């Protein structure tokens, strides 16, 4: 009945929408035909959901982020709507392979990593929980670049994801808005005027966000820059305004103070706030109840400008008195802190802001005066306190500390993991938290069980549902029921078979994609995340070389075989990250082609790591590498995906790793290396990498091989830069955790030789992953920050 | 496809396609819902038509043009498909106004004027005649600019026609192709290689072209430039390649040798030829029969590069020997000449071509040598003949004469009107026509009766069909049957009522759009075409001022009232055209606000003249101004639209105007002024505008008022530039035709006072318009140049 109508709709779309028949249709046409067939099932509910929010007017949540790492939409939509099985059958009956059609879809890679994926995971949870929430960002013409490996090096290729069209976005021409830039401030008797500005239009594109089996369809609104309204040159120059939403800055945890980036931040903030204000004034709910109807979450400081923009609107446009506007503003905004790394901190030079946003610079100054006046009144003698709490930094050049603007403009500030939120509250912003202790909170990150379990690992989800029901999908805490099977050998072998099939499926991937032959029974050791010195795939590379030498030493020694996979993109300007990639492809080349090691150890640099590819490798993983230096990874989410999918974790007591051990029992994770306190002690005492290289014979060998050209014969000093940083500038102490790491790694393999105990531990991990659902994360945000409830 | 199912489809699209309901839908959503509803009716026939061409493999026609002035598509499609009445009813039942929805659609203004509209009219006729024809152009992101009038001056606004989406285009991703630029030529032992080039991808977008009531749906394929595959800057720099299809050059009859324009020309040529070759090799058809399967018409010299590109492909890629390739090339191409005006002539500097297209420059040189060798062999003593017939001009800087390249690479060359084709053949290219007399031809232009009668003037089409049947739609020569009603007073009054209702409808337009109050019973005097010194709306402006003074002179004099309308866009760099516009808005301001003239004379500068707006004003017109200097307007097509729609013509013996008099009887048109020979005689003898200003008292007054600030008090010398050109540099002799013009105009008004005789003449015009159908034009092209059949 349903299968029949689905095949009918597909043929209808292929004909009328793609203008094709079965003899001339391309694979891309079949994908689009299916996408349209599935898309139609979203319309009724999307209209009803948005209409419901208008009628019953519940408090609305607006997740304002410069990034939304959404991945592919077809499968996700089919699943949340309960149409996957019917569609799978419809496509099969028509003689096609749904998997092939699914591969046609481009990832919507409008994010760099964890930050943009958290936003994506949050949209899915907010819809599944039935909250009146909206995602607001920029519709980048180009997302995170596609990565290629040339002569072992990363090469960037433009990610032209819209070239063939996106059936999942809906232009909303009637809501276009003008955004202002430059110009000059004019203080009149009717109020202050921001005049002589250049205008860039913002056209919003709505993408539906289907809740998991609940008839709710929320919206993700992305803005695209358009020019307003020598002739030829004047028309070509329209490219200049449209360049604002042209490309996503491909840096993870790195502030790049480019003027264009500033424009993107203001662009999305101005369009968004105007749209929210307009929706408020049409709600039939004059802004007294604004914050009882509106909640705006600042995802990192990127949209910090939203604070003085709201004030600008309230004061300059709506004519509200400063005091009242300031109060509403704080009740409206909440700020989420995502990192304590110095290079990620946004500090915009007042000069640049003055030229681009002169009125906003005056507003920020005013906020700062009112702010410092309060502090001067309570702590008179304390002069330096004012210096430390100011939104303005006069170090060399004067600049705005965006993080401080976010704190004073918000009623709630949160970190993303216990350890991180603690550091944010008591160390980094001690001066602020002391004054307003109730302001700072923690909201441990999470991942959505739909995309990261049900979609990416159907085999595992089925096994679990077979044993404990399907309720866990909407309430992952349900996974603890998996404990009852701890001594169940048949279940443990079923668990091990699912993982075995994931590995085989992914092995097929690696062999067609890459030269090398993979040992499907080897242990899959994986580290996939953005290349960073702080995340240390370098430390991992030190271990791979160690295992290499060891085999070369004693060839016939009983060695648990491994397929080591390291994948991730480096920001374009990050030289060390790029050197580390080359170092890894070099090592692999030597290991994979050495006859004495052969099928014992294989190394793969998984290129173009991205959301759709994460969905493949993660379910096939046995060992998840989460080895950042303690105190560096604010939270992490990749660690959670691997835990939910049956992999054991080797890592430090950092970010959310700590809470994973808490939930699963430290004994059921391979924790190692320095802890927050240990890195501190070492810092005070002073770190000298040279000493470990001295003490550690296995390390000295690894290092001498790198620095001598053993892994770059034609370029003997190619890795000279890596050697120098490690010996004289390693802020992340690679050599200091090397011994504990290799020791920890040895124990992992020992446990791997015992299938029954390895799988018993995996079970304890999966049964303990319930806390890491973004459904739980969102619930806490909802009741402790946004003050909202399901609809 | 009746009313109930049409309303159903509309609601379905509004819901699933526009994601709306009746309470939140916008007017734009309603337009799109209807467009999609109508579009669906094209799919079956479009797939079957293209499939038919593959199976039965008839010789195909490819109209290669840098311009396609298509206008709006909804109404046209509804009409050619016989769905207009049903849709009209469906939309009405749903509580909407189809006229309002139709106004939402943007014109597809991918052309400047006559040249691009001729291409558009040809696509409609080729589909109605059932020919296997394709239109190949560039999908400009921006078409001809939208014109605004600020402080009486034209201002240009970007024509962002794709902003909200084009439901009539279909991306054809599987046929994307790479186009090459720059690089360098490498002569090897395996053949010549064009290497180290930069690549720009070309993605084609197909638009259906429905034939009139015949199940045929052809294709118009437009190419869009896309880049292949410091980081941020590198991605932004992708804008540079995509800039190739960014904007239409807004010049009419004017060559602007900009490098970007050269890129556009090669771009469309390279993508098009590769696509045609590929389709040829898949036809199930050896390039021996290539020209028996392919015909490529060069619309003006703009795609001239297609000749050495085809050769490049045949020789460098397909490895054919030069002689064989050259033969197939000539049998493939045919060239159409659209103008004899010097500023429109394409002469690209060999330097620029050398850098951008080094391999094509070598090919053009080779063609020129083989060409001159032939001429040297037949006319040894004649040295200067070689200089005159060369594709290369060494005057100052060396440059390529694109027109000469088109002549030698084509087997047929045609003009667009008898008088023009004659000049092209015997005067301009005498050296070539003498050698190959059979090469040069004429193919008088035409307009499609669908868009230009049935669509734009439903009232007239109905009246005609009521009296002589509907066969005239597909065979306009049928209009001669209208003669039988020449003495029929009731028919003549019915004819006059249709024109009366057009005027009222358009008057509603002019009053809401413009301040002024219009006399619906006044004579609508109209001149709408691109602003050009050669088209002379200036001469027209001299007459308006004349009528003005006359009224001021004798207020109570019996004067047939007029609503004078002049509209058109000036190219951005054309200073004189812009000055003339300002001069016209200035005059209007004075006339329209002068209490002594009042409702006697009103002047309007119809802004943003374009295809959809032509469809409104043309049917409402009584008098059509076709007054270019004799010998300047190669043909004209606006003249034909007005004739088919019931307007009388006042004009010179130029372009197709001459043939209009031939068909309708010179007596039934208001011809005047110098003729081709008269302008020549005056040229030899020397023209001195000062003498007419001397002799003509009415003229002297007009001129003194202009030059003294009567029409620009705050800027007394504002029109100084206009005065100078008219006295010392008027290549188009405005003062010389002024007297004959005003005299001719006086007679027009005299005939207008006699409704029965005016309408009797209009009837003789309409009944004689059959020759000007583009169906007849295409039939002649098909049997005498392309050698193709339905
Ligand atoms: O564009 C059409 N369908 C659309 C269908 C579509 C819509 C959204 C996403 C993917 C596909 C189409 O093919 N594309 C939009 C993409 C782009 O903008 O690049 C590609 C279309 C159907 C049709 C049918 C007729 Cl009869 C005439 C013109 C037509 N265009
Ligand atoms: C038929 C014709 C077309 C012209 N088109 C243009 C044009 O498109 N742009 C421009 O800048 N000038 C144009 N001109 C003006 C020309 O370049 C030159 O400036 C004047 O003719 C010198 O008086 C045109 C002139 C003529 C006669
Ligand atoms: C989850 C995810 C990340 C974040 O990974 P971490 O290891 O937690 O930094 C990055 N990239 C992609 C594509 C992801 O799916
Ligand atoms: C037909 C047409 C033209 C050509 O008119 P002429 O009077 O022949 O110059 C130019 N522009 C538009 C919009 C047209 O419809
Ligand atoms: C170069 C150019 O645009 N020429 C124009 O071509 C059209 C189409 O043939 C003619 O009707 C017109 O008189 C002529 O001015």
| Distance, CA of A503 to CA of A167 (rounded, Å) | 32
Enclosing H/E stretch for A415: strand A413-415
Question: In B, which residues are within 8 Å of A21 by CB distance?
Answer: 47
Q: Which residues contact B470 (CB under 8 A, 6 or more apart)?
A: none
CA A611 from centre of chain: 9
Using the 8-state DSSP alphabet, how is residue A447 labeled?
A: B
| Residues A217, A127 contacting (CB under 8 angstroms) | yes
| Distance, CA of B206 to CA of B223 (rounded, Å) | 9
Report the residue of A16, A52, A204, A232 to disrupt the B interface, i.e. the one with the largest count of B CBs within 10 Å.
A232
Enclosing H/E stretch for B583: helix B575-592
Asked if the Cβ–Cβ distance from B236 to A243 is below 8 Å, we say yes
The token pair at A62 is 């607006």
Exposure letters A260-272 (e unless 16+ CB within 10 A, then b): bbbbbbbbbbbbb
Asked if the Cβ–Cβ distance from A249 to B232 is below 8 Å, we say yes
| Residues A266, A306 contacting (CB under 8 angstroms) | no
Burial of residue B575 (CB within 10 Å: 0-12, 13-18, 19+) is exposed
CA B37 from centre of chain: 30
Find, among B691, B703, B689, the residue nearest to B542 by Cα: B703
3-state secondary structure (DSSP) of residue B709: coil
| Distance, CA of A735 to CA of B64 (rounded, Å) | 68
Q: Annotate B674-700 with three-state secondary structure.
A: CCHHHHHHHHHHCCCCHHHHHHCHHHH
Spell out the alpha helix ranges (H) of A554-672: 575-592, 611-617, 638-644, 657-664
* For chain B, counts of helices (H) and of strands (E): 32, 25
Question: In A, which residues are within 8 Å of B243 by CB distance?
Answer: 236, 239
Q: Which of A21, A163, A235 sits opposite B246 (nearest CB)?
A: A235
| Distance, CA of A342 to CA of A348 (rounded, Å) | 14
**Which residue has 């469906």 as its token pair?**
B90
- CB-ligand 1 contact for A755 (6 Å cutoff): no
The token pair at B41 is 């009716």
| Distance, CA of B624 to CA of B660 (rounded, Å) | 13
3-state secondary structure (DSSP) of residue B504: helix
Report the residue of A27, A231, A250, A571 to disrupt the B interface, i.e. the one with the largest count of B CBs within 10 Å.
A231
| Distance, CA of B657 to CA of B669 (rounded, Å) | 9
Ordered DSSP codes for A486-534: TT-HHHHHHHHHHHHHHHHHHHHHHHHHSSS---TTSEEEEEES---TT
| Residues B623, B525 contacting (CB under 8 angstroms) | yes
Ordered DSSP codes for B371-387: HHHHHHHH-SS-HHHHH
Find, among B275, B259, B233, B277, the residue nearest to B181 by Cα: B259
Q: Sort residue B240 into left (φ over 0), alpha (ψ -120 to 50) or beta.
A: alpha
The Cβ of residue A187 has, within 10 Å, a number of other Cβ atoms equal to 8
Q: Annotate A295-339 with three-state secondary structure.
A: EEEEECCCCCCHHHHHHHHHHHHCCCCHHHHHHHHHHHEEEECCC
| Distance, CA of A236 to CA of B221 (rounded, Å) | 24
Asked if the Cβ–Cβ distance from B227 to A158 is below 8 Å, we say yes
Ligand 5 centre from B415 Cα, in Å?
10
Using the 8-state DSSP alphabet, how is residue A435 labeled?
A: H
Spell out the alpha helix ranges (H) of B390-488: 402-409, 418-423, 430-435, 458-468
Burial of residue A456 (CB within 10 Å: 0-12, 13-18, 19+) is buried
The token pair at A679 is 């890195």
| Distance, CA of A289 to CA of A134 (rounded, Å) | 19
The alpha carbon torsion through B617, B618, B621, B627 (nearest 10 deg) reads 110
| Distance, CA of A385 to CA of A375 (rounded, Å) | 8
| Distance, CA of B771 to CA of B756 (rounded, Å) | 25
**Method by which the coordinates were obtained:** X-ray
| Distance, CA of A565 to CA of A584 (rounded, Å) | 10
**CA Rg value for chain B:** 27
Find, among B275, B60, B278, B282, the residue nearest to B179 by Cα: B275
Nearest protein Cα to ligand 2, atom 7:
B574
Q: List C-alpha distances in Å: B397 to B185, B255, B352, B394.
A: 23, 16, 11, 6
Find, among B450, B569, B448, B459, the residue nearest to B506 by Cα: B459
The token pair at A589 is 């080349």
CA dihedral sign of residues B497, B503, B509, B514:
negative
Q: Annotate A44-90 with three-state secondary structure.
A: HHHHHHHHHHHHHCCCEEEEECCCEEEECCHHHHHHHCCCHHHHHHH
Find, among B134, B218, B283, the residue nearest to B786 by Cα: B134
| Residues A612, A72 contacting (CB under 8 angstroms) | yes
3-state secondary structure (DSSP) of residue A209: strand
Q: Which of B16, B572, B573 sits opposite A43 (nearest CB)?
A: B16
Find, among B121, B207, B30, the residue nearest to B443 by Cα: B121
First to last CA, chain B: 27
Asked if the Cβ–Cβ distance from A247 to B232 is below 8 Å, we say yes
B56 is catalytic: no
Q: List C-alpha distances in Å: A251 to A343, A731, B644.
A: 11, 19, 65
| Residues B279, B204 contacting (CB under 8 angstroms) | no
3-state secondary structure (DSSP) of residue B368: helix
Q: List C-alpha distances in Å: B708 to A86, B543, B561, B719.
A: 83, 18, 28, 9
Percentage helix, strand, coil, to 5, in chain A? Answer: 55, 15, 30
| Distance, CA of B347 to CA of B354 (rounded, Å) | 14
- CB-ligand 2 contact for B580 (6 Å cutoff): no
| Distance, CA of A536 to CA of B292 (rounded, Å) | 68
Q: Which residues contact B448 (CB under 8 A, 6 or more apart)?
A: B121, B124, B125, B128, B773, B774, B775
Q: Which residues contact A31 (CB under 8 A, 6 or more apart)?
A: A74, A101, A102, A104, A105
Using the 8-state DSSP alphabet, how is residue A628 labeled?
A: P
3-state secondary structure (DSSP) of residue A762: helix
Ligand 2 centre from B744 Cα, in Å?
29
> Which residue in A338, A439, A450, A569 is the catalytic one?
A338
| Distance, CA of A470 to CA of A462 (rounded, Å) | 9
| Distance, CA of A50 to CA of A59 (rounded, Å) | 13
The token pair at A373 is 């006046």
The token pair at B509 is 């337009």
- Cα angle A121, A126, A131 (rounded to 5 degrees) comes to 170
| Residues A391, A404 contacting (CB under 8 angstroms) | yes
The token pair at A491 is 């279940």
Find, among B375, B436, B364, B435, the residue nearest to B405 by Cα: B364
Strand bridging mode B60-64 / B133-138: parallel
Q: Do domains B2-446+774-788 and B447-773 have the same CATH topology?
A: yes
Strand bridging mode B294-299 / B184-187: unpaired
Find, among B427, B430, B365, B414, the residue nearest to B391 by Cα: B365
B637 is catalytic: yes
| Distance, CA of A134 to CA of A279 (rounded, Å) | 12
Q: Which residues contact A788 (CB under 8 A, 6 or more apart)?
A: A58, A59, A60, A61, A131, A132, A133, A295, A782
Enclosing H/E stretch for B122: helix B114-128
Find, among B532, B530, B460, B451, the residue nearest to B494 by Cα: B460
| Distance, CA of A725 to CA of A533 (rounded, Å) | 10
Distance from CA of A245 to the nearest CA of B (A): 11
Report the residue of B33, B219, B224, B235 to disrupt the A interface, i.e. the one with the largest count of A CBs within 10 Å.
B235
Q: Which of A173, A234, A235 sits opposite B164 (nearest CB)?
A: A173
Asked if the Cβ–Cβ distance from B170 to A19 is below 8 Å, we say yes
| Distance, CA of B325 to CA of B319 (rounded, Å) | 9
Q: Which residues contact B255 (CB under 8 A, 6 or more apart)?
A: B343, B344, B345, B346, B347
The token pair at B154 is 């034209």
Ordered DSSP codes for A448-494: -TIIIIIIT-HHHHHHHHHHH-SGGGT-GGGGGGGGGGTT-HHHHHH
**CA Rg value for chain A:** 27
In B253-332, where do the E strands start and end? 294-299
Between A402-409 and A358-378, two packed helices, what is the crossing angle to 10 degrees?
Answer: 70
The token pair at B672 is 């005047």
The CATH number of domain B2-446+774-788, selected from 3.40.605.10, 3.50.50.60, 3.40.50.2000, 3.40.640.10: 3.40.50.2000
| Residues A742, A586 contacting (CB under 8 angstroms) | no
Question: In B, which residues are within 8 Å of A243 by CB distance?
Answer: 236, 239
Q: CB-hemisphere CA count at 13 Å for A118?
A: 28
Exposure letters B587-621 (e unless 16+ CB within 10 A, then b): bbbbbbeeeebeebbbbbbbbbbbbbbbbebbbbb
CA dihedral sign of residues B193, B194, B198, B203:
negative
Listed by start position, the domains of chain A span 2-446+774-789, 447-773
Burial of residue B202 (CB within 10 Å: 0-12, 13-18, 19+) is buried
Strand bridging mode A146-150 / B670-671: unpaired
| Distance, CA of A478 to CA of A493 (rounded, Å) | 21
| Distance, CA of B494 to CA of B499 (rounded, Å) | 9
Spell out the alpha helix ranges (H) of B379-516: 383-389, 402-409, 418-423, 430-435, 458-468, 489-513
Find, among A223, A1, A217, A212, the residue nearest to A90 by Cα: A1
| Distance, CA of A269 to CA of A256 (rounded, Å) | 18
Enclosing H/E stretch for B347: strand B347-349
* CATH number, domain A2-446+774-789: 3.40.50.2000
Exposure letters A127-165 (e unless 16+ CB within 10 A, then b): bbbbbbbbbbbbbbbbbbbbbebeebebebebbbbbbbe
**Which residue has 């170092």 as its token pair?**
A583
Ordered DSSP codes for B731-746: TT-HHHHHHHHHHHHH
- Is A54 within any annotated ligand binding site? yes
First to last CA, chain A: 32
| Distance, CA of B471 to CA of B488 (rounded, Å) | 22
| Distance, CA of A738 to CA of A722 (rounded, Å) | 16
Question: In A, which residues are within 8 Å of B173 by CB distance?
Answer: 26, 28, 163-164
The token pair at A1 is 């009945």
| Residues B459, B498 contacting (CB under 8 angstroms) | yes
3-state secondary structure (DSSP) of residue A566: strand
- Is A21 within any annotated ligand binding site? yes
3-state secondary structure (DSSP) of residue A394: coil
| Residues B610, B630 contacting (CB under 8 angstroms) | no
3-state secondary structure (DSSP) of residue B566: strand
- Cα angle A305, A309, A314 (rounded to 5 degrees) comes to 155
CA A638 from centre of chain: 9
Chain A touched by B191 (CB under 8 Å): no
Q: What CATH superfamily is the domain A447-773?
A: Glycogen Phosphorylase B; (3.40.50.2000)
Burial of residue A393 (CB within 10 Å: 0-12, 13-18, 19+) is middle
CA A479 from centre of chain: 24
Burial of residue B688 (CB within 10 Å: 0-12, 13-18, 19+) is middle
In A664-727, where do the E strands start and end? 670-671
Q: Annotate A341-358 with three-state secondary structure.
A: CHHHCCEEEHHHHHHHCH
């Amino acid at each position: 009945e349903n299968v029949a109508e689905l095949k009918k709709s597909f043929n209808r779309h292929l004909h009328f929408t793609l203008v094709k028949d079965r003899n001339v249709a391309t694979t891309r046409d079949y994908y689009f035909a299916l996408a349209h067939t599935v898309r139609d099932h979203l319309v009724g509910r999307w209209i009803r959901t948005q209409q419901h929010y208008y009628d019953k007017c519940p408090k609305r949540v607006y997740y304002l982020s410069l990034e939304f790492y959404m991945g592919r939409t077809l499968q996700n939509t089919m699943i949340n709507l309960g149409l996957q099985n019917a569609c799978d059958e419809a496509i099969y009956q028509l003689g096609l392979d749904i998997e092939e059609l699914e591969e046609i879809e481009e990832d919507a890679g409008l994010g760099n990593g964890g930050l943009g994926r958290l936003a994506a995971c949050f949209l899915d949870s907010m819809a599944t929980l039935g909250l009146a929430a909206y995602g607001y960002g920029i519709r980048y013409e180009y997302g995170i670049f596609n990565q290629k490996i040339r002569d072992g090096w990363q090469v960037e290729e433009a990610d032209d994801w819209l070239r063939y069209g996106n059936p999942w976005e809906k232009s909303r021409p009637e809501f276009m808005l003008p955004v202002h830039f430059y110009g000059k401030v004019e203080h009149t008797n009717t109020g202050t005027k921001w005049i002589d500005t250049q205008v860039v239009l913002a056209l919003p594109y709505d993408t539906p966000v289907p809740g998991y089996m609940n008839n709710t369809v929320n919206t993700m609104r992305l803005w695209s820059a358009r020019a307003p309204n020598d002739y030829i040159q004047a028309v070509l120059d329209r490219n200049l305004a449209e360049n604002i939403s042209r490309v996503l800055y491909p840096n993870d945890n790195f502030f790049e103070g480019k003027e264009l980036r500033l424009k993107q931040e203001y662009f999305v903030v101005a369009a968004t706030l105007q749209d929210i204000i307009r929706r408020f004034k049409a709600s039939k709910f004059v802004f007294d109840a604004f914050p009882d109807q509106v909640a705006i979450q600042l995802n990192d400081t990127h949209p910090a400008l939203a604070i003085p923009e709201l004030m600008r609107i309230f004061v300059d446009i709506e004519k509200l008195p400063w005091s009242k506007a300031w109060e509403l503003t704080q009740k409206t905004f909440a700020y989420t802190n995502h990192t304590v790394l110095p290079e990620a901190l946004e500090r915009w030079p007042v000069d640049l802001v003055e030229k681009l946003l002169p009125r906003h610079l005056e507003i920020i100054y005013e906020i700062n005066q009112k702010h410092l006046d309060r502090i001067v009144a309570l702590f008179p003698k304390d002069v330096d306190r004012l210096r430390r709490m100011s939104l303005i930094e006069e170090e060399g050049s004067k600049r705005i500390n965006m993080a401080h603007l976010c704190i004073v403009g918000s009623h709630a500030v949160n970190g993303v993991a216990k350890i991180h939120s603690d550091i944010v509250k008591t160390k980094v912003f001690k001066d602020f938290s002391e004054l307003e202790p109730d302001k700072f909170q923690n909201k441990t990150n999470g991942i959505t069980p739909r995309r990261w379990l049900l979609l990416c690992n159907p085999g595992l989800a089925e096994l679990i549902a077979e044993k404990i029901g399907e309720d866990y999908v909407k309430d992952l805490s349900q996974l603890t029921k998996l404990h009852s099977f701890l001594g169940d050998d048949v279940f443990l072998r079923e668990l091990a078979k699912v993982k075995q099939e994931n590995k085989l499926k992914f092995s097929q991937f690696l062999e067609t994609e890459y030269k090398v032959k993979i040992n499907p029974s080897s242990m899959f050791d994986v580290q996939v995340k953005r290349i960073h010195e702080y995340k240390r795939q370098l430390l991992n590379c030190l271990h791979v070389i160690t295992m290499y030498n060891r085999i070369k030493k004693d060839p016939k020694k009983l060695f648990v075989p491994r397929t080591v996979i390291i994948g991730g993109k480096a920001a374009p300007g990050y030289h060390m990250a790029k050197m580390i990639i080359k170092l890894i492809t070099s090592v692999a080349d030597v290991v994979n082609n050495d006859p004495m090691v052969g099928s014992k150890l294989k190394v793969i640099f998984l290129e173009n790591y991205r959301v759709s590819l994460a969905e493949k490798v993660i379910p096939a993983t046995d060992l998840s590498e989460q080895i950042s230096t303690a105190g560096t990874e604010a939270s992490g989410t990749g660690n959670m995906k691997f835990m939910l999918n049956g992999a054991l974790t080797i890592g430090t007591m950092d970010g959310a790793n700590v809470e994973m051990a808490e939930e699963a029992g430290e004994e059921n994770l391979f924790i190692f290396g320095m802890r927050i306190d240990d890195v501190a002690a070492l810092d005070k005492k002073g770190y000298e990498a040279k000493e470990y290289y001295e003490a550690l014979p296995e390390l000295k060998l690894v290092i001498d091989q790198i620095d001598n050209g053993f892994f770059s014969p034609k370029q003997p000093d190619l890795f000279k830069d890596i050697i120098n940083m490690l010996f004289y500038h390693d802020r992340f102490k690679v050599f200091a955790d090397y011994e504990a790491y290799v020791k920890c790694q040895d124990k992992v393999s020992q446990l791997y030789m015992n299938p029954k105990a390895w799988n018993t531990m995996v079970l304890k991990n999966i049964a303990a992953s319930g806390k890491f659902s973004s459904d739980r994360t969102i619930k806490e945000y909802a009741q402790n920050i946004w003050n909202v409830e399901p609809s």
